[PDB]
Design a protein around this ligand. Structure first.
Ligand code: ZN
Ligand code: ZN
Lengths: 143, 142
């Protein structure tokens, strides 16, 4: 459904589409998200087309994340944000719009930011027994 | 914030219980007791680092290397419709536990306790503005 040939991020990697580049190495490319939900909003992507988190190998995942602190620190040093978020969306129903794995690096400046997490705990819907069974179910499936 | 007062360091040290999903030499993953969605899991380094800015490349790679296999296990078991990763740094960005950690959040639908407010500012930037912003960041990367 989402092939490399039709992928806009692969087109950026291949230079057919322009980007405002923040960092590049053999494994990853980082460039500004044109939406700029906050000033300096940056995307970190693997050069190899992987659709979402479930398709990353350990090596690609390592290469992607290994550059995040240095990029976050650069944004921090230059724009002095009060906070910072990382976000990744997988699946149309979870907000994914470009089907090439990417992490959003989002600096926060305060009250008037374009990003915010709506967050609600469902803690009391679970007993101790329930959590133990959810945890072992996941644990036993980890490859 | 200190390492001796850190809840996650206590869990790593076995002074506090957790619902363990995965552990290796460098990382520990366990359920977030808030369970914003069923199977909501935290992945944390065993070494105390407060936030994204204090991670070394080596620690960052250890953390993320195991995320896809944990995300896949959650997906295989509960068939979510989607999935999000979230990390909060600084109290103004939502951080409440001061030991770096990633939230792995499966998504099922309308009862989900995670959502994003997302406001584009695309038309407030020219190409020149974006070029200058990017260069400023690029030149500051150490
Ligand atoms: Zn692609
Ligand atoms: Zn700690």
């Amino acid at each position: 459904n989402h092939t490399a040939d039709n992928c806009i991020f692969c087109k950026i990697i291949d230079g057919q589409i322009l980007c405002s580049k923040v960092y590049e190495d053999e494994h990853v490319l980082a460039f500004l998200d044109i939406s700029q939900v906050t000033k300096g909003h940056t995307l970190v992507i693997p050069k190899v087309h992987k659709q979402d988190i479930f398709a990353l190998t350990p090596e690609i995942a390592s290469h992607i994340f290994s550059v995040v602190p240095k990029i976050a620190n650069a944004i921090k040093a230059e724009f002095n944000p009060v906070g910072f978020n990382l976000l990744n969306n997988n699946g149309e129903k979870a907000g994914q719009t470009v089907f090439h794995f990417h992490l959003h690096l989002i600096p926060r400046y305060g009250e008037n930011d374009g990003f915010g997490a709506v967050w609600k705990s469902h803690q009391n819907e679970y007993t101790m027994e329930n959590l133990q069974n959810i945890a072992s179910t996941i644990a036993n499936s980890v490859k």
